[PDB]
């Protein structure tokens, strides 16, 4: 039961393939065309079925060359409106038909952001990008919008001829549009079955540069050189991912670097990972996000969660693989450092929600909950903490990586629940079942709050961060002079970040301390987005007015929700910036990403 979808479930029928033929109209901000669904009945005598839709305009539905009857149900908030289609002939079990739906999107499509030329790098052309996860695919095309169904797809996309279209698929050529010579048609094929949340489309003034044997980087011209360098470790990460997970089956691993309003650090669209330009630190320091997106090529895209209640399967195993990639590249002490930081972020998320909040559960119940509202670090870090704890219980990383590989092999091309995972865990480790039975499954999987057991972490790289943070927190006024730029001498960017994270957990600090920190460390000069984010939060929570314009600028000049949401909230909580925060939100709202706009608005208690 997928409680987020209004469509016929996989038990009733299942989409096998989508052929998408559409045209991107920047003047109207609509995508217009046809979705031909090849649908296989799972039932005897099937006479109707139901698809998800959201703010779609349906022109007609055609089966066997003729228009058929359909009806759009009443809108159910964020889930959209169900579309019931009356089949012309009753179908037997396993019979397949093709249903061709003519449709057009709304400019308000929660799947899409339409950018004016002035919102891009080049300032001449507009730009469009999608983001379907979790349940926004229904906002682009009518579909069974549930990850419990996997389909192949092909697409032909007509765009203004000066622009480029890309999708989560292999590029299959380009031509002039025979119906409109100011246009080009780009073609795409995705031969590996995917859940519909992995369908993606970008259209803009895109250039590419090759950075490995199976990876091009795509962006506007002004970001291409910087991106090629930032992500140069991509091939080496892919090789390691393939060693841990099995064959990379998707063909290409390209990267697309989006404009700054892109709402997530990255999105694992198959063949074309989408990433935030806030990763462009200049020193490859935020490359863990690439490792994470690469890892999804196995955990998430090959083995997929059956419903969003089981999202942690996708994320926990991805973070687990991500951290192994980073440990291979930079050493086991480094894996433990990132693991231990992740526990910190989990502490934060639980503290923010409250230790009894249902969204701090590992398996959640999304009945009547917008998935975008529930989204947090919990499934990532609670899921990782579970896997790390099991690793230590069951004999160590080599042993647990054997399990992870066998798990991917077992459930490739399938969608699964937590009980499937747990069942296979018990099967794989059946000689260690007595150890497995010592795990508090109910607490770990189903209870709110921090997990019942914290794993063991190497502290080596973290000690200096904690030590410096403690010096600052325990400092009195007459200790401030002792701080000096040399305190940072032997700290990496990852350590400066962890120092700020540790300090931010005890915020506010006295204003005099924060002013001193700027004096001696000049954190205002650091443009690493993770570091700047935490520093600005520490400044604002410690009531430093000078930081207000800095925080407002970062909150609005990029749109990664990880950064924009807490910055707006912090600025709302500070009396001196509260009205500015609300005003700035109001002014920027119309040009923000629709989901980001909705969430910041809720956070601010606005509109
Ligand atoms: C992208 C956007 C929203 C979601 N939401 C599903 C979800 C959130 C938190 C916990 N469990 C499941 C997932 C991906
Ligand atoms: Yb003193
Ligand atoms: Zn992920």
UniProtKB/Swiss-Prot annotation:
UniProt effect for mutating residue 265 to A: No loss of activity
Residues reported to bind Zn(2+): 292, 296, 315
Binding site for a peptide: 131-133, 263-268, 560-562
Pfam families, per the entry: Leuk-A4-hydro_C, Peptidase_M1, Peptidase_M1_N
Tissue specificity note: Isoform 1 and isoform 2 are expressed in monocytes, lymphocytes, neutrophils, reticulocytes, platelets and fibroblasts.
SUPFAM superfamilies xref list: ARM repeat (SSF48371), Leukotriene A4 hydrolase N-terminal domain (SSF63737), Metalloproteases ('zincins'), catalytic domain (SSF55486)
Stated consequence of mutating residue 381 to Q: Reduced aminopeptidase activity. Minor effect on epoxide hydrolase activity
Mutagenesis or variant effect for residue 560 to A/K/M: Abolishes epoxide hydrolase activity. Reduced aminopeptidase activity
Localisation per UniProt entry: Cytoplasm
Stated consequence of mutating residue 315 to A: Complete loss of LTA4 hydrolase and peptidase enzyme activities
GO function term, MF aspect, one: tripeptide aminopeptidase activity
Regulation: Inhibited by bestatin. The epoxide hydrolase activity is restrained by suicide inactivation that involves binding of LTA4 to Tyr-375. 4-(4-benzylphenyl)thiazol-2-amine (ARM1) selectively inhibits the epoxide hydrolase activity.
UniProt site (Essential for epoxide hydrolase activity, but not for aminopeptidase activity): 372
First-tier enzyme category under EC: hydrolase
Requisite cofactors: Zn(2+)
PTM summary: Phosphorylation at Ser-412 inhibits leukotriene-A4 hydrolase activity.
Biological process, per Gene Ontology: leukotriene biosynthetic process; lipid metabolic process; peptide catabolic process; protein metabolic process; proteolysis; response to peptide hormone; response to zinc ion; type I pneumocyte differentiation
Cofactor note: Binds 1 zinc ion per subunit.
Keyword field: Acetylation, Cytoplasm, Hydrolase, Leukotriene biosynthesis, Lipid metabolism, Metal-binding, Metalloprotease, Phosphoprotein, Protease, Zinc
Consequence of changing residue 133 to N: Aminopeptidase activity almost absent, but keeps LTA4 activity
Modified residues (Phosphoserine): 412
Site (Pro-Gly-Pro binding): 268, 559
Function comment: Bifunctional zinc metalloenzyme that comprises both epoxide hydrolase (EH) and aminopeptidase activities. Acts as an epoxide hydrolase to catalyze the conversion of LTA4 to the pro-inflammatory mediator leukotriene B4 (LTB4). Also has aminopeptidase activity, with high affinity for N-terminal arginines of various synthetic tripeptides.
Protein name: Leukotriene A-4 hydrolase
Organism in which the protein naturally occurs: Homo sapiens (Human)
Taxonomic path: Eukaryota, Metazoa, Chordata, Craniata, Vertebrata
């Amino acid at each position: 039961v997928d409680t987020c979808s209004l469509a016929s479930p996989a038990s009733v029928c299942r989409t096998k393939h989508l052929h998408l033929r559409c045209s991107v109209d920047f003047t109207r901000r609509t995508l217009t065309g046809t979705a031909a669904l090849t649908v296989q009945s799972q039932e005897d005598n099937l006479r109707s079925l139901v698809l998800d839709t959201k703010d779609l305009t349906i022109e007609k539905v055609v089966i066997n060359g003729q228009e058929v009857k359909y009806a759009l149900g009443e809108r159910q908030s964020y889930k959209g409106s169900p579309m019931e289609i009356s089949l012309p002939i009753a179908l037997s079990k396993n019979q397949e038909i093709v249903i061709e739906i003519s449709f057009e999107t709304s400019p308000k499509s929660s799947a899409l952001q339409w950018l004016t030329p002035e919102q891009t790098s080049g300032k001449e052309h507009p730009y469009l990008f999608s983001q379907c996860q979790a349940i926004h695919c229904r906002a682009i095309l009518p579909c069974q919008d549930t990850p419990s169904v996997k389909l192949t797809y092909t697409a032909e996309v007509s765009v203004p001829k000066e622009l480029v279209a890309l999708m989560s698929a292999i590029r299959d050529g380009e031509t002039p549009d025979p119906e409109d010579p100011s246009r080009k048609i780009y073609k795409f094929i995705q031969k590996v079955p995917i859940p519909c949340y992995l369908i993606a489309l970008v259209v803009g003034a895109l250039e590419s540069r090759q950075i490995g044997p199976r990876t091009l980087v795509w962006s506007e011209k002004e970001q291409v050189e910087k991106s090629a360098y930032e992500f140069s470790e991509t091939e080496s990460m892919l090789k390691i991912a393939e060693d841990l997970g099995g064959p990379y089956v998707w063909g290409q691993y390209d990267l697309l670097v989006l404009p700054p309003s892109f709402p997530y650090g990255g999105m694992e669209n198959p063949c074309l990972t989408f990433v935030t330009p806030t990763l462009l630190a200049g020193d490859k320091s935020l490359s863990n996000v690439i490792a994470h997106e690469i890892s999804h090529s196995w955990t998430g895209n090959l083995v997929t969660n059956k419903t969003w209640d089981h999202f942690w399967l996708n994320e926990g195993h991805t973070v687990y693989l991500e951290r192994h990639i980073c440990g291979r590249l930079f050493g086991e002490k480094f894996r433990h450092f990132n693991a231990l930081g992740g526990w910190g972020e989990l502490q934060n998320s639980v503290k923010t929600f409250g230790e009894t909040h249902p969204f701090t559960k590992l398996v959640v119940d999304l009945t009547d909950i917008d998935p975008d509202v529930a989204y947090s670090s919990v499934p990532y870090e609670k899921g990782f903490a579970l896997l790390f704890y099991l690793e230590q219980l069951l004999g160590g990383p080599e042993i647990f990586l054997g399990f992870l590989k066998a798990y991917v092999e077992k459930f490739s091309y399938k969608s699964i629940t937590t009980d499937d995972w747990k069942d296979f865990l018990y099967s794989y480790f059946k000689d260690k079942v007595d150890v497995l039975n010592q795990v508090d499954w109910n607490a770990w999987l189903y209870s709110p709050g921090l997990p019942p057991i914290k794993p063991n972490y190497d502290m080596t790289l973290t000690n200096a961060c904690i030590a410096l943070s403690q010096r600052w927190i325990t400092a009195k006024e007459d200790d401030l002079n002792s701080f000096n730029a040399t305190d940072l001498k032997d700290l990496s960017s990852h350590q400066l970040n962890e120092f700020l994270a540790q300090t931010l957990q005890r915020a506010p600090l006295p204003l005099g301390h924060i002013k001193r920190m700027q004096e001696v460390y000049n954190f205002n000069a650091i443009n690493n987005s993770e570091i700047r984010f935490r520093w600005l939060r520490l400044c604002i929570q410690s009531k430093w007015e000078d930081a207000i314009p800095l925080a407002l600028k970062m909150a609005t000049e990029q749109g990664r929700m990880k950064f924009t949401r807490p910055l707006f909230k912090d600025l709302a909580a500070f009396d001196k910036s509260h009205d500015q925060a609300v005003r700035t939100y109001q002014e920027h709202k119309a040009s923000m990403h629709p989901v980001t706009a909705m969430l910041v608005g809720k956070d601010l208690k606005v509109d």
